[PDB]
Design a protein around this motif. Sequence first.
Motif, short mmCIF file in Angstrom:
data_model
loop_
_atom_site.label_atom_id
_atom_site.label_comp_id
_atom_site.label_asym_id
_atom_site.label_seq_id
_atom_site.Cartn_x
_atom_site.Cartn_y
_atom_site.Cartn_z
N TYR A 29 -10.83 12.25 4.11
CA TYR A 29 -10.50 11.95 2.96
C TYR A 29 -10.19 10.41 2.88
O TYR A 29 -10.39 9.92 1.73
CB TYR A 29 -9.04 12.72 2.50
N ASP B 59 7.45 14.09 7.28
CA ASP B 59 7.53 12.84 8.72
C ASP B 59 8.98 12.42 8.54
O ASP B 59 9.30 11.64 9.39
CB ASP B 59 6.47 12.06 8.44
N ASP C 235 3.66 14.08 2.99
CA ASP C 235 3.63 13.73 4.21
C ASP C 235 5.03 13.10 4.77
O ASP C 235 5.57 13.24 5.45
CB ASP C 235 2.40 12.63 4.50
N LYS D 112 6.18 0.13 4.78
CA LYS D 112 6.83 1.50 5.21
C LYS D 112 7.44 1.12 6.50
O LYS D 112 6.98 0.55 7.20
CB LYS D 112 5.72 2.51 5.11
N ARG E 286 7.93 3.81 1.27
CA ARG E 286 6.41 3.81 1.08
C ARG E 286 5.99 2.84 -0.05
O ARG E 286 6.63 2.84 -1.04
CB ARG E 286 6.13 5.15 0.83
N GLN F 262 -6.90 5.11 11.49
CA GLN F 262 -5.74 5.93 11.77
C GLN F 262 -5.09 5.07 13.22
O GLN F 262 -4.11 5.30 13.40
CB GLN F 262 -6.04 7.36 12.23
N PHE G 291 -1.12 13.99 -1.19
CA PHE G 291 -0.81 14.14 0.37
C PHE G 291 0.26 13.25 1.04
O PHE G 291 0.99 13.69 1.86
CB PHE G 291 -2.16 13.69 1.27
N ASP H 222 -3.33 2.32 11.90
CA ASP H 222 -2.05 2.62 11.30
C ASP H 222 -1.16 3.15 12.27
O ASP H 222 0.39 2.95 11.99
CB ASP H 222 -2.45 4.14 10.59
N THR I 58 -8.39 17.84 5.55
CA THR I 58 -6.90 17.29 5.80
C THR I 58 -5.74 18.17 6.03
O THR I 58 -5.07 17.54 6.86
CB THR I 58 -6.82 16.24 4.41
N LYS J 162 -7.20 14.85 10.02
CA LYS J 162 -6.15 14.19 9.00
C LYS J 162 -6.40 13.09 8.21
O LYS J 162 -5.77 12.83 7.20
CB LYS J 162 -4.78 14.10 9.65
N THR J 163 -7.22 12.30 8.65
CA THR J 163 -7.68 11.13 8.16
C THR J 163 -9.02 10.80 7.78
O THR J 163 -9.42 10.29 6.70
CB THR J 163 -6.71 9.68 8.73
O1 LIG Z 1 2.64 8.10 6.75
P1 LIG Z 1 1.59 7.39 7.30
O2 LIG Z 1 1.19 6.49 6.02
O3 LIG Z 1 1.94 6.61 8.35
C1 LIG Z 1 0.10 8.44 7.80
O4 LIG Z 1 -1.14 7.66 8.12
C2 LIG Z 1 -0.26 9.17 6.58
C3 LIG Z 1 -1.43 10.07 6.78
C4 LIG Z 1 -2.35 9.96 7.45
N1 LIG Z 1 -3.37 11.00 7.26
C5 LIG Z 1 -2.81 11.49 6.52
C6 LIG Z 1 -3.18 13.05 5.68
C7 LIG Z 1 -2.56 13.52 4.65
C8 LIG Z 1 -1.32 12.91 4.46
C9 LIG Z 1 -0.86 11.70 4.87
N2 LIG Z 1 -1.87 11.30 5.96
P2 LIG Z 1 0.41 9.43 9.01
O5 LIG Z 1 -0.44 10.36 9.41
O6 LIG Z 1 1.04 8.44 10.32
O7 LIG Z 1 1.84 10.25 8.71
#
Ligand SMILES: O=P(O)(O)C(O)(Cc1cnc2ccccn12)P(=O)(O)O
Lengths: 337, 337
Positions: free
Chosen positions: B191, B94, B90, B244, B99, B227, B86, B230, B154, B187-188
């Motif tokens: 998983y 994004d 991602d 990151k 990372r 999340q 993922f 995050d 997800t 999304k979070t």
């Molecule tokens: O890039 P991060 O690490 O900040 C990130 O938190 C990455 C993230 C959150 N949930 C998922 C699900 C699938 C793939 C990536 N995912 P974000 O949701 O903010 O893109």
Amino acid sequence: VYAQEKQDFVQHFSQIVRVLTEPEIGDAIARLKEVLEYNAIGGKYNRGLTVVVAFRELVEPRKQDADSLQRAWTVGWCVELLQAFFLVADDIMDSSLTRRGQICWYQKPGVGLDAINDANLLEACIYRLLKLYCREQPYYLNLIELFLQSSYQTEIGQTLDLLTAPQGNVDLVRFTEKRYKSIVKYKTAFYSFYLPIAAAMYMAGIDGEKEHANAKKILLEMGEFFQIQDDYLDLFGDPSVTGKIGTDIQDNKCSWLVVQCLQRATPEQYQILKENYGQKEAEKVARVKALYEELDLPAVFLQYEEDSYSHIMALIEQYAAPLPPAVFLGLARKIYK
Amino acid sequence: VYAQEKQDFVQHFSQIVRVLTEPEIGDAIARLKEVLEYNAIGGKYNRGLTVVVAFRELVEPRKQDADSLQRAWTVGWCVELLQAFFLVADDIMDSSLTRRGQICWYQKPGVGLDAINDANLLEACIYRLLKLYCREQPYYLNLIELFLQSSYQTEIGQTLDLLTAPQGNVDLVRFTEKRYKSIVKYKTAFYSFYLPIAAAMYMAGIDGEKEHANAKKILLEMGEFFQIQDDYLDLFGDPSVTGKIGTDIQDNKCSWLVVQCLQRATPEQYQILKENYGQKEAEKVARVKALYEELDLPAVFLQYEEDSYSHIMALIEQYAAPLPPAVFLGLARKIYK
Ligand SMILES: O=P(O)(O)C(O)(Cc1cnc2ccccn12)P(=O)(O)O
Ligand SMILES: O=P(O)(O)C(O)(Cc1cnc2ccccn12)P(=O)(O)O
Ligand SMILES: [Mg+2]
Ligand SMILES: [Mg+2]
Ligand SMILES: [Mg+2]
Ligand SMILES: [Mg+2]
Ligand SMILES: [Mg+2]
Ligand SMILES: [Mg+2]
């Protein structure tokens, strides 16, 4: 025997889409529907149809009830979705322009690299359908494992495809027959003809190891030819028939054509290829095509098609039994048309 | 209880890599190894560790033989690979830069959009490991279905994330609390904490529906907080700790911060946000950050963290039983550090 089973296979998509599309995730469901409608439609459906056709031919017609037949169409649609998932991603990675008579999904304004997650969703639908329709069947886990393993093999093939075809990086000595055969075995042979026939086998309670190995011996070879044809058609096919613009020369691909070219070329022809292969300039691609024509590669392809047909026929005679040879014959009629 | 189980979890990666890496596909295998080494390493391993820790806590220590424990580490590594698959995708979608303390895989010279197929391969390894180590266990199919369904959920979340955050396309009225909670659930939440605990449940023979629903009630909420954290850390975190560079403001994300900003802003503050959100210019991103600071969003986050902690604690008191509360307590110690 396909031709007179399509429209009913195809008709069933609307029901596939309806169950996969049954409040907070509404916008996501609406996008899945869009993705399914754009990307799982508009091809020939020969891979999904093969599951249906083979299922009829392998299952005693008295087990062929309304629910069994519904499961067959569903698993056939599963195979179409596997294809769709791979093609969406493959068009991104191959920098392709059109597919199935319309711009590639990722080229759509407002899609772009979101299509990566769209592709993943298509994959996920395979297993959602399998659960929804097949979870109580004795072959449920055989099917799951078949789709997963088919995917793994295909991605290993995609890995070789992309390794052997690095952007900006000519190296023609990579492009060998041995190399070619391995790429196409993995990237195409498994998920194209082995998968759908094997699925119908499992659904028919044919799960023997040896019986699957024998079916393979025929089907992996059919798949090899089908990719050789696909490569020939990339340069020499009519985009209004194939539904796609070819990219192999510019993408620096280990195409069957470039392999056959390399087998034939004068040292001076070698230099023309090396100077012009793997580059975006129409001029340079046109030069490669003219070398291929110089070398009579269209005639070489037509001869290989005839010899490969006879070979697959030989293999059907050796390996079909105890399966109805029509299983393999129908398919071969469809691909060597 | 994690901290004193890592190095052994982490030590086992070398064996994961070795079995997945066991002639024609050699180059592809070598690339898989590269992919695994770059992308499954360098994080905190809290998700994979949770499978190991919870397995010890749920399984009578007399079933905890050498093979059972090996299966636990493997399934934990499965969860790490799901994450890795993922995240690789991602970061592409994004437009991220780093990372885990190094450039994103897709940004690597000579990788680029090949990483799409690399991500798929990582996914495929999940199911290869499950077969290799778990195929004879009564929970084999529970696990397969758990990983597949976790992926589907997800990707539906990823779909909402990307829909609600269209490039070039401000529309702040989209960014609501109701919307936010749904995105992050899918999304979070699934998983991240439900998956690894649920896996250890299944492996422990805890397959009750009601027992999984109760574990969910706690774990989905933990995942929501995680999340929210995050998102806060995307703007306010130290990149040398998080590993990151943040992208949420430029990517036009329905971040928790932008939701909290919108709840608070004067009509004039609204216009500053709308004028500056969703754009690549450092100037404009800096303006958004200063509005967020104007609004004391760091203080609002610290307060929410305290209230969410107390909430999750309440939920553990209601819902843990008959599972050892330590299962949930260990995890919560790790995330609300
Ligand atoms: O890039 P991060 O690490 O900040 C990130 O938190 C990455 C993230 C959150 N949930 C998922 C699900 C699938 C793939 C990536 N995912 P974000 O949701 O903010 O893109
Ligand atoms: O683009 P096409 O349609 O010409 C192509 O034939 C597509 C193709 C062949 N094999 C695979 C496996 C996974 C994904 C796509 N695959 P090719 O291999 O030439 O990219
Ligand atoms: Mg390709
Ligand atoms: Mg292609
Ligand atoms: Mg092609
Ligand atoms: Mg994201
Ligand atoms: Mg991200
Ligand atoms: Mg983030």
